[PDB]
Structure 1
């Protein structure tokens, strides 16, 4: 339309409009209190309704980023609270928007959300239901400034249905807590997953994201032709490009169009989409992003015919390189659902390098004749890591598997901060519980693509305050080689041991009131400092103090002397 705020308001509806606007303000301004954002969203909602009445009204023709950007600069003393971020309000679009994306804090030093009692939450949900949900959208968006905004509406919908169903049940806690705990675990999984898509677009460009899109969509939709996948790749790229840039209104509007196009052409795409297109609009897009791999068509020809033994290999490649390379990736991904997306990108990167080198000779066919043999070592490298690590996880258990990976990556890069090393290594142990139970046919695609997400978490957490050059090297190298780069790292011998500090290993009775999951994080934190202090400590010596630690906390917390057991054991 002529008025862009009117086009999104009419397409998204008023309810989703207010929600996405609140997510936009909370991701950009994360430290601003909840009451300040409510005023801004309502003033945008009031202004949006005036443009729906007449698209030729005042200020209705300006861009969505100028509107949202000007409103962000109206909150007084933004420089006082956010420091030097207000220097970017003195800029013009799209420069002002680019810096507002630069100041997004992945770790925004916010206090952990203390969860009130179930009856208190059910009371607040009954008092002001509209305010209760807005607090959920607000608190989540601050701590996850790259959250998939259309998905966050779905989490908010299930967060509402949880309180609607459980607050009427006799045992409210037995109903609500399993749903709230599952929503939190699934929520952080969606955030870290979406952060990889944004980091791929911002750091490596659209070209690196389209290659990822061609691979995963071909694995998931093997029956669709290349022109149909290229249509879905181009549209899906536009959706995530807008969401990562802050275009949350255009993003959710374009995802609804993509989910509508996919569901209207299921026969040309996949057979697994039938049961999910019967769901509501917000639930429909969620499942399609997680639907199972469609059965690949039987009797497919070997890829040597089209790409190795052909006369126009260099002719078609020189005419359209990225198109010819895109066809190779689509044809290789649809046939191998047992490969990870990242592995398929390495093979496509390997095949591209060969054509650039071999098509220059006078006899190109004789040069790239054994190009597919070059893929053999690349396929076996992740399989050996997953086979060895799953054997280590199955014989140790998740918590012990985290500690084993914790010491491993702490010795690899001891410069990274302890809180970053703890969270990343804890999520590095969850891949064992996630997909070491899978057979080898589905073990590699899930294990490695999960590692790319968790390693990218270490990438962005270290990007803000770079303390180690080896992490920065493996992060900015080539994205697809992030896991091999990190896995090929060895013990950092140049690292000097950190000086001793007795205040780090002191404790109080507050650890006893903490939850079991929060208590082991307190224990894993001391293990990182222990490995940093003694980088040459053997694996069994680390157990003696950690086994001493586990029994010493259980002994002190169970006894009657509140702070005497902890203080007397401070020697």
Structure 2
């Protein structure tokens, strides 16, 4: 059955009545902030102001049955004024002629939000509690907008309840330690869900799946496909299900349950995973397994790129095997394996795999070698030590380069490595920089 023509109206009115104008305004500040990540504090506060106005009016007893649908359209009309006081999704204009109801916004891979010190937090809270709370809901939600809405509302709510409670405490510092530890669960759930969901949003279910298999393979190289594949597939399913779900339990419930499986199956296969699984709660474990770096790879003989006739378990097997033995970050592997399996597939008939096989095998081999050079030394040394060796590398390969030029290439390369040579490098950003870096490869 299809949702009622007025599914939205009845929803907002039901919320406005259950929460009151103040809390509904907060709910809306968070909601439109995550929806418009690039929106200034005033464009979002202004829009939120209009939304709450229409809602109050159109939900009022005796309100014209057309009200809500009429005002919301006059709201969209204003969003096309060019000199509009409202935010705007990428290319919202190419729609101002209802796509403006559900348009996409890319994830934030480099959040700028920086929680101020306790002293600064309380200094701003004293000045103006309402202001502080609003500015906070905006900046936080715009920076971690990929986390489910219920999680953002719940976290920003509990966080503010902490500031008000600790800034007026006889022992602020003591209160903050207590409150921050009780907030840990939700805080971790919120920030981590945003991150995993942003990666998911950037990749899409298919790449995401592959990505999680690659990453799990690099964390536990000495594991069996059957040990990780089910896990990589489990998280992908939780991602596609919970990242964009109004169910205020999906993520909150699913994520902790994934961690239990993670530990049940991987606890006894790696020293690091054992340590991770010894943590107190699920989220403490998840943060540990999520941050776990690519491990020292076993180093085995080369792997063959499947090119026979052939469900979908041979390519998974190959990915697993390749990644567990190739020292190259996941953003590189995901970047090349995608357009490599698109070729093998569009091949299937047999004659094809005989003219492409060698073609795909070489480019992939060439790609892998290129990345290993762009990421050379990065993982094995402290950053300052990596920069030295790098300069030593680039020097003996550019004898005519002036000390100044040399240092310019060093800075550029190391800058790239600090962003795209680790296990959780940002997909959207690195996919574009990898292209550029390869061209300049030298």
TM-score, normalization by structure 2: 0.55
1:347/1:275 Cα in 2 relative to 1: closer, same or farther (>3 Å)?
same
Note if 1:101 corresponds to 2:90.
no
TM superposition shift of 1:262: 0.9
1:375-454 matches, within 5 Å, as: 376-387=365-376, 393-394=387-388, 429=415, 432=418, 444-446=421-423, 450=425, 452=427, 454=429
SS in 1 for 2:266: coil
SS in 2 for 1:32: helix
Deviations 1:58-86 (A, max 9, x none): 9xxxxxxxx99975864894434249988
How far, CA to CA, are the matches of 1:260 and 1:7 in structure 2?
Answer: 29
TM superposition shift of 1:132: 3.5
Matching residue of 2:30: 23
How far, CA to CA, are the matches of 2:152 and 2:338 in structure 1?
Answer: 34
1:366/1:304 Cα in 2 relative to 1: closer, same or farther (>3 Å)?
farther
**Contact 2:211/2:334 (CA < 8 Å) preserved in 1?**
yes
Deviations 1:308-367 (A, max 9, x none): 6xxxx734x2xx4x554234324434x348431123235634763774598744697999
Deviations 1:249-296 (A, max 9, x none): 35x6432242143145345543246456725xxx56972772537999
1:238/1:332 Cα in 2 relative to 1: closer, same or farther (>3 Å)?
farther
**Contact 1:125/1:132 (CA < 8 Å) preserved in 2?**
yes
How far, CA to CA, are the matches of 2:54 and 2:167 in structure 1?
Answer: 34
SS in 2 for 1:387: coil
How far, CA to CA, are the matches of 1:158 and 1:404 in structure 2?
Answer: 48
How far, CA to CA, are the matches of 1:339 and 1:211 in structure 2?
Answer: 15
Structure 2, unaligned runs of 5 or more: 181-189, 268-272, 392-403
1:253/1:285 Cα in 2 relative to 1: closer, same or farther (>3 Å)?
farther
1:355/1:16 Cα in 2 relative to 1: closer, same or farther (>3 Å)?
farther
Structure 1, unaligned runs of 5 or more: 49-57, 59-66, 107-111, 180-186, 398-402, 410-424, 436-443, 457-474, 476-481, 492-571
SS in 1 for 2:32: helix
- Among 318, 331, 336, the residue aligned to 1:328: 318
Note if 1:483 corresponds to 2:434.
yes
Note if 1:34 corresponds to 2:38.
no
How far, CA to CA, are the matches of 1:343 and 1:39 in structure 2?
Answer: 45
**Contact 1:73/1:89 (CA < 8 Å) preserved in 2?**
no
**Contact 1:431/1:450 (CA < 8 Å) preserved in 2?**
no
SS in 2 for 1:325: helix
1:156-235 matches, within 5 Å, as: 156=156, 161=162, 168=169, 197-201=200-204, 206-220=205-219, 222=223, 224-235=227-238
Matching residue of 1:122: 122
How far, CA to CA, are the matches of 1:285 and 1:428 in structure 2?
Answer: 31
How far, CA to CA, are the matches of 1:331 and 1:285 in structure 2?
Answer: 26
Matching residue of 2:252: 256
Matching residue of 2:185: none
Matching residue of 2:400: none
TM superposition shift of 1:147: 4.6
RMSD between superposed Cα atoms in Å: 6.4
Note if 1:342 corresponds to 2:331.
yes
